[PDB]
């Protein structure tokens, strides 16, 4: 089935800039502008998620009750696919969580809310991380010059002869909202509180950790100030005239959205179920 | 012929042109997840039997950009004659580079006379070098998986010659239905008209798949792996050439999943007066 | 020995004479003396066959066919019944050959030979040795007759041991005849090699074709369409070689590249094989491309669409889609291989066949009668490796970590580059032989390694002309390849992180793709089967001898001054994937291919005296980049500079406004201007900057975020400012005088600003001195 399509639209603004490299620069497609690529944010919002219920496996076992047979830890020591520690999937260095199979994969709630592959498993991602493409304000500032971009320089300082060496980085400057959305697939209706409730708590372990590249010094410290939940439930597209929910916009601090409005926010979604 | 057409106001990047077949199964999967299981495309069998998709490029502006008129290959120098002699070099960007023009250097690009090829493409097929993440550590792993960037105000559009009954019941709806990040997609209908003289030998517009009808035609090859299962290759005509001996290259059905996968390439002609062959 | 043994040597020995008869050895005409020469070459390999050849060097300073009388007299004296024929079978093809060498085209004895791409420049005599110092068309100076004498010297001591067949004639007289003057004469563009090749292509076309001197004598052979023209062109190339992905590794290019010129040559020697013709009837086979003077009979254009048809075939079962031939015949006639009435009939022929093969090759794959069908078969997965990408479990995982599995094309293929460095050549047999490493179309190959003796009736042999250690059985077939390559400590091929790690500067491969700029337009303006076999062998010997001289280090006293990004070692870090043709693609350490890029152009530009002129793409990635992206990115560059004024390099991919008045490409007088100009003030040598720059090295970086501002806008003139801005604040007052004044030369003429040129002279040190 599908009834879906849940569009999280807002802005981030990069408080101290950021660093989605490619000296090292940030992304810049076609017309000189930087941009936060949707799989950057899309990867970076599930390590924290994963991280989160590798922490939190143990204790949550009978919601998500596939989320039982892992027992943490990393695949690495014991080198082999399928090792039950949390994760596998050893692509060329890296050990990331898929779970390997569509029937597990309905359950898990990092790998049903990011999908699975691998052989014989093929589970859509159920959500779709537009890029955040520099909102108006930024455009037409970009306009007169401004330099959207910030080379910044830093070093290696050693201590026995205490020489340095530049290693520049280019950022982008601290303060610019980039439009940013989320377009959320809503299949399997029972699934669907928990999981926008998990979206939203690994987008709360943002604004208190490093996007974009060589964060934990600067670099990162982002804000999602989002403003419209909507909803595309099945008339969206068939018709489109009217009839889709509108929630508030102006001031919702996601730390606070996650729950202090969000089931007053709930209960109008509940008003169409359906 | 006012066959009308569907621009596809982007948001970023796409992975491919879609290639004139990878929207019908598309749309397959668009009514499929609307209108339950028993009004797709089985149900659109005859309504796709007279009506066609046919993809076709972006726009860059307002220009409709369309193929190529594969019947100026033949006798390019039939055409150039008022050129000076070293009208040579034109060809090869009128062979060679040959990849999309405008449409009042369509609607005389076939028809023979001299058109002119544009420079105005809106492609940026950049070298993306995406990710490289080990959840708990260091991982080097560049893989690049490239795709294709657009211009600033540029974007995909694609045609439909049929019954606007039809395009209102199962296209149109699904074509804002599609709108990890490159399915940026915004929908703006629109019409337009082609000249499109005389019906002897003309173009099919899309990719195809012919009743066994050879002349003058790119070959392709499109694999696709559809719900899991690895497509076969299904030799394909490439965008813009001519088989008008009367086609009607049905669509092909596949195997591999419980309903079965059937694959699009049946066309719709235009206006071509080609000059021998 | 039978006629047509006869005439291919009779039409390859009809000219003979004159490189004795510039030597002095006797007295007469060129007919003569030629004859003379021989009538002791019978008595020395025993073999009387030399004495018939006599009657085929008996033709010119013509009246001797008012002397044909006389003319059965002096054949009757050397009784031709000896070896299987009679009087008339014989004046047959005499008359035969006479009327061919007026089919090859429409005073003072030390004229040289006069270059074919500029007509004024020449040569001095050389010999066809790539290994040595390899000749370009200077000032027109006399060929002193000592070196005709040590011509005629080395061609007794090389005839005698030679065999007397075509196979062994032709790369005999190839060696030392190439570039002799054919006709002494101004202008005249065609050599005595490409003469005779021609000559005894259609004397065997002529006799094959059934006509005789009751024919000739008439002159009706140059009316009656007794030819055929075939061309073939190999379309998808550039998809053959290059659609691998990232498991594909150097060795498996370059076999590649070998296997796609071992197709080509299958074909065209099945196509000389099969319609009775010597190597002698191919004008040239070079990139794919190849064009075949044939006899033109009812039952050979049966032959030729067997041929085709099976080759097609073939191709199509073998290599889906990704590599069409399309052979095309013409039937010519004797009168357009001539300027004939002012206009050029064989170029118009030619014209009229390249619009035929261009008609063939938009209906790619014509001629197969299941291509369009349904019905698929089960169980199909693509290799990683090739795009073969339809095989059914056939596929075989070996040559590697052996749980990928692979085609058995690229399974043969890596084992083909194991033997690629010790490989001597291969043999052409029958494809279900011992040995047999790789198929054709018709034939399959048995690589002849350094000790080994296969035989298939023909020998492939690389880049030389003596056979040496092969059999007197089969038919010694050379064939030329660009072979350099960066041998690693054990002696094998580099890969891309074998080659990159020799980067002075940044760790990136360098890749080069060129092609030869408006060669297309150059073969319609040449009126001879001698001028085109001539302008298309020097062109492919550039392309395919010359290239590993100019990488080795040679030719350094006309290149001179290119942009040295370092010391050019011993043996470079340089791999060429394929050069051929016109085109070629070399990969290595970017350092060198920067370097090489300006070497091949220079020395190209040297070679056919500036007539002509070199487009080439550059391009660097990561060591891990795919292929299929690395040749990608080089052909659209090679497309944009070939766009956009048609001789232009493009050096490194670079930022520019969207008007139509900045364009990407580099001229050559203008990139090497630049490097002359910015290089040395502000580059040391080996990848150390200069002394002012010394210590602060961030200085360049700041001249592209200036230039930034310039191409996000070029009508705002902070740029010329921020540049002495910069400058200023260091001290270095002088090393950038043109930006820092807006010139007004260039806002004149609607010509872009002199910062807008500078970063492609900046990047390159900038790659240079990183860490
Ligand atoms: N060494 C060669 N000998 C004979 N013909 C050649 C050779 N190299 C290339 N050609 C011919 O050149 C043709 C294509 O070359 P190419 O397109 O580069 O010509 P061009 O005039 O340079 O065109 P463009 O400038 O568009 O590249 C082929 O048909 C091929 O037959």
Not at chain 1, 180 to 201: A, G, P, Q
Not at chain 3, 288 to 293: A, D, E
Not at chain 3, 567 to 578: A, C, K, Q, T
Request: hydrophobic share 40%; proline share 5%.
């Amino acid at each position: 089935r599908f009834y879906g399509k849940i569009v999280i639209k807002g802005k981030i603004k990069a408080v101290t800039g950021l660093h989605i490299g490619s000296n090292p620069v940030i992304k810049d497609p076609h017309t000189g502008l930087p941009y936060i690529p949707g799989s950057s944010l899309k990867g970076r919002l599930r390590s924290l998620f994963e991280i989160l219920v590798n922490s939190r496996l143990g204790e949550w076992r009978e919601k998500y009750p596939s989320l039982a047979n892992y027992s943490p830890g990393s695949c690495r020591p014991d080198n082999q696919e399928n090792c039950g520690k949390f994760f596998n999937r050893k692509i060329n260095r890296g050990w990331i969580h898929v779970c390997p199979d569509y029937e597990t994969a309905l359950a898990c709630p990092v790998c049903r809310l990011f999908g699975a592959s691998g052989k014989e498993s093929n589970f859509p991602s159920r959500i779709i991380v537009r890029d955040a493409f520099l909102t108006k304000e930024w455009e037409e500032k970009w306009r007169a010059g401004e330099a959207i971009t910030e080379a910044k320089i830093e070093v290696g300082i050693d201590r026995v002869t205490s020489q340095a060496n530049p290693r520049t980085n280019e950022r982008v400057v601290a303060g610019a909202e980039f439009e940013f959305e989320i377009i959320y697939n809503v299949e399997n209706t029972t699934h669907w509180r928990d999981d926008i409730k998990n979206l939203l708590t690994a987008m709360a372990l943002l604004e208190d950790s490093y996007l974009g590249g060589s964060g934990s010094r600067g670099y990162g410290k982002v804000k999602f100030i989002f403003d419209s939940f909507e909803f595309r439930p099945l008339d969206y597209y068939r018709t489109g005239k009217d009839e889709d929910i509108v929630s508030i916009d102006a001031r919702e601090k996601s730390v606070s959205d996650i729950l202090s409005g969000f089931d007053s926010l709930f209960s109008e979604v509940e008003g169409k179920l359906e | 012929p006012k066959f009308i057409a569907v621009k596809l106001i982007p948001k970023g990047p796409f992975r491919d042109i879609p290639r004139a077949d990878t929207l019908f199964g598309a749309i397959g999967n668009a009514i499929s997840a609307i209108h339950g299981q028993s009004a797709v495309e089985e149900l659109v069998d005859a309504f796709v039997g007279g009506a066609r998709i046919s993809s076709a490029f972006p726009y860059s502006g307002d220009t409709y950009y369309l193929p190529k008129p594969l019947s100026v290959e033949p006798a390019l120098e039939g055409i150039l004659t008022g050129l000076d002699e070293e009208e040579r070099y034109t060809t090869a960007k009128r062979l060679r580079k040959a990849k999309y023009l405008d449409l009042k250097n369509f609607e005389l690009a076939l028809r023979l006379r001299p058109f002119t090829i544009p420079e105005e493409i809106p492609y940026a097929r950049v070298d993306v070098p995406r990710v490289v993440l080990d959840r708990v550590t260091q991982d080097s792993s560049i893989y690049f998986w490239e795709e294709i960037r657009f211009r600033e105000k540029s974007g995909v559009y694609f045609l439909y010659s049929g019954p606007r009954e039809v395009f209102d019941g199962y296209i149109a709806p699904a074509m804002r239905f599609l709108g990890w990040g490159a399915g940026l997609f915004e929908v703006e209908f629109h019409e337009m008209k082609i000249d499109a003289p005389g019906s002897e030998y003309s173009v099919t517009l899309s990719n195809a798949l012919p009743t066994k009808t050879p002349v003058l035609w790119r070959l392709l090859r499109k694999g696709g792996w559809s719900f899991g299962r690895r497509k076969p290759r299904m030799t394909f005509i490439a965008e813009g050439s001519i088989v008008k001996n009367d086609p009607g290259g049905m669509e092909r059905l596949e195997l591999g999943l419980s309903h079965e996968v059937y694959v699009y390439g049946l066309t719709f002609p235009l206006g071509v007066e080609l000059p021998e062959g | 020995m039978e006629i047509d043994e006869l005439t291919a040597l009779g039409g390859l020995l009809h000219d003979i004479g004159k490189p004795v008869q510039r030597a002095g050895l006797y007295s007469g005409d060129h007919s003569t003396q030629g004859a003379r020469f021989l009538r002791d070459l019978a008595e020395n390999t025993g073999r009387a066959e030399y004495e018939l050849l006599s009657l085929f060097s008996e033709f010119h300073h013509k009246g001797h066919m008012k002397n044909d009388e006389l003319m059965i007299r002096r054949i009757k004296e050397l009784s031709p019944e000896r070896f299987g024929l009679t009087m008339e079978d014989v004046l047959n093809a005499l008359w035969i050959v006479y009327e061919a060498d007026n089919l090859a085209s429409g005073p003072q004895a030390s004229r040289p030979l006069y270059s074919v791409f500029n007509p004024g420049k020449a040569y001095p005599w050389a010999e066809l040795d790539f290994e040595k110092e390899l000749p370009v068309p200077g000032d027109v100076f006399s060929i002193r007759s000592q070196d005709y004498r040590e011509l005629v010297k080395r061609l007794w001591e090389e005839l005698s041991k030679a065999k007397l067949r075509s196979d062994r004639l032709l790369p005999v007289l190839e060696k030392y005849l190439t570039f002799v003057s054919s006709v002494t004469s101004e202008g005249n563009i065609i050599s005595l090699y490409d003469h005779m090749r021609m000559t005894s292509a259609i004397a065997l076309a002529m006799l094959r074709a059934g006509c005789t001197a009751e024919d000739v004598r008439s002159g009706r052979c140059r009316k009656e369409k007794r030819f055929l023209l075939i061309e073939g062109d190999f379309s998808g190339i550039q998809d053959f070689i290059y659609r691998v992905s990232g498991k594909g590794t150097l060795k498996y290019l370059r076999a590649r590249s070998a296997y796609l010129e071992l197709i080509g040559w299958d074909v065209v020697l099945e196509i000389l094989s099969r319609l009775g013709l010597t190597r002698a009837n191919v004008v040239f086979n070079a990139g794919g491309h190849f064009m075949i003077i044939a006899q033109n009979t009812p039952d050979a254009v049966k032959e030729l669409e067997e041929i085709r048809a099976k080759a097609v075939e073939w191709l199509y079962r073998e290599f889906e889609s990704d590599l069409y031939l399309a052979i095309e015949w013409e039937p010519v006639s004797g009168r357009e291989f001539g300027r004939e009435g002012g206009k050029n009939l064989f170029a118009e022929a030619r014209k009229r066949l390249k619009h035929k093969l261009t008609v063939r090759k938009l209906k790619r794959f014509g001629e197969i009668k299941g291509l369009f069908e349904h019905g698929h078969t089960e169980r199909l997965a693509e290799c990683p490796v090739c795009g073969r990408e339809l095989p059914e479990g056939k596929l075989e995982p070996s040559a590697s970590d052996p749980e990928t599995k692979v085609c058995p094309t690229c399974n043969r293929l890596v084992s083909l580059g194991g033997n690629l460095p010790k490989l001597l050549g291969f043999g052409r047999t029958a494809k279900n032989d011992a040995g047999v490493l790789v198929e054709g179309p018709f034939s399959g190959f048995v690589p002849y390694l350094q000790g080994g003796r296969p035989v298939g009736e023909q020998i492939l042999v690389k880049n030389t002309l003596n056979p040496g250690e092969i059999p007197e059985s089969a038919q010694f077939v050379p064939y030329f390849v660009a072979d350099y390559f960066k041998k690693d400590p054990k002696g094998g091929v580099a890969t891309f992180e074998e080659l990159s790690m020799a980067s002075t500067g940044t760790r990136r491969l360098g890749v080069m793709k060129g092609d030869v700029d408006r060669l297309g337009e150059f073969f319609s303006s040449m009126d001879s089967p001698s001028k085109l076999a001539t302008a298309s062998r020097f062109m492919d010997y550039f392309f395919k001898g010359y290239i590993g001289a100019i990488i080795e280090g040679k030719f350094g006293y006309i290149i001179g001054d290119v942009p040295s990004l370092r010391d050019w070692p011993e043996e470079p870090d340089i791999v060429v994937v394929y050069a051929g043709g016109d085109d070629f693609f070399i990969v290595g350490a970017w350092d060198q291919i920067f370097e090489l890029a300006f070497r091949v152009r220079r020395a190209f530009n040297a070679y056919t005296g500036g007539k002509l002129t070199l487009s080439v793409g550059l391009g660097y990635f990561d060591e891990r980049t795919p292929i299929y992206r690395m040749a990608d990115v080089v052909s659209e560059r090679l497309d944009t500079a070939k766009d956009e004024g048609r001789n232009r390099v493009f050096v490194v991919g670079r930022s520019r406004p969207l008007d139509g008045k900045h364009k990407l490409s580099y001229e050559w007088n203008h990139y090497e201007e630049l490097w002359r100009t910015y290089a040395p003030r502000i580059y040391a040598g080996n990848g150390r900057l200069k002394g002012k720059l010394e210590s602060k090295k961030g200085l360049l970086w700041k001249l592209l975020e200036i230039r930034e501002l310039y191409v996000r806008d070029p009508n705002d003139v902070r740029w010329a400012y921020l540049t002495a801005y910069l400058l200023g604040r260091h001290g270095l007052s002088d090393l950038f005088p043109e930006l820092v004044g807006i010139d007004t030369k260039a806002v004149e003429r609607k010509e872009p600003q002199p910062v807008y040129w500078v970063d492609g002279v900046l990047k390159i040190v900038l790659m240079a001195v990183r860490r």
